[PDB]
Amino acid sequence: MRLPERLVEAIAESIIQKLGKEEGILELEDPATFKKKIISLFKEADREEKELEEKAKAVLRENLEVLERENIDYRTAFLAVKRKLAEEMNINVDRRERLNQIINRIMDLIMKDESVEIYEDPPVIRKKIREIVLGALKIEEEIEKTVRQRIKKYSRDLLEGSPEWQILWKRIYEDELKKRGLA
């Protein structure tokens, strides 16, 4: 479940533009700081997902001999362990359900930010943030679909998921953003 920097910034800006400037259901006394706070929420949520991965790999690393004796493939055990740790860490694995958590964290920020005022029922504000996030995710998904088509020709030369593979994915992703005018 990727949330690249450009997607996060598009969501934060769209929240400020649509709900703050256009509709006016949010009053932001410091839009620049509010945007930084939203970006920090996504960064923290990303760090949690990375921590979930390292804890899952730690379990399997410690149970190498057991997995062999059990005849359970690493990939099977990884998905199962991740499902369990995700519940214990209250991290939704589905990116859409995970975004609902992040959206609620944005609502938590909005509600506690002394530099923000709201003029509409919070659950209605959440529904509107969900619509903004879902619209941006539709764009992210059509971009990722092209990135997967373009990185296929390099799939066998790099270990999928490795740091070198992540760099190439990001490089192809940035190139798609330029071709599409999305910075």
Residue numbers in the entry: 1 to 183
Provide the authors' original text about this structure.
AaDUF507 is a Y-shaped α-helical protein consisting of an anti-parallel 4-helix bundle base and two helical arms that extend 30-Å from the base. The tertiary structure exhibits pseudo-twofold symmetry. Structure-based query of the Protein Data Bank revealed no other protein with a similar tertiary structure, leading us to propose that AaDUF507 represents a new protein fold. In summary, considering the SAXS data, which reports on the oligomeric state at low protein concentration, and the crystal structures, which provide information on oligomeric structure at high protein concentration, we conclude that AaDUF507 is predominantly monomeric in solution.
The two crystal structures differ by a 25° rigid body rotation of the C-terminal arm. The electron density map for the C2221 structure indicated an unknown ligand bound to the protein. The electron density resembled a 6-membered aromatic ring with a small, planar functional group attached. The density could be modeled satisfactorily as nicotinamide, although its true identity is unknown. The unknown ligand site is a pocket located in the junction between the 4-helix bundle and the C-terminal arm, near the intersection of αA, αF, and αG. The ring of the ligand is buried inside the protein and the functional group protrudes out into the solvent. The modeled ligand forms no hydrogen bonds with the protein, as judged by a cutoff distance of 3.2 Å, and appears to be stabilized mainly by nonpolar interactions. With the C-terminal domain rotated as in the C2221 structure, the arms of the Y are closer together and the pocket opens. Docking against the C2221 structure generated six consensus clusters located in the groove between the two helical arms. Cluster 1/4 is unique to the C2221 structure; apparently, the 25° rigid body rotation of the C-terminal arm opens this site.
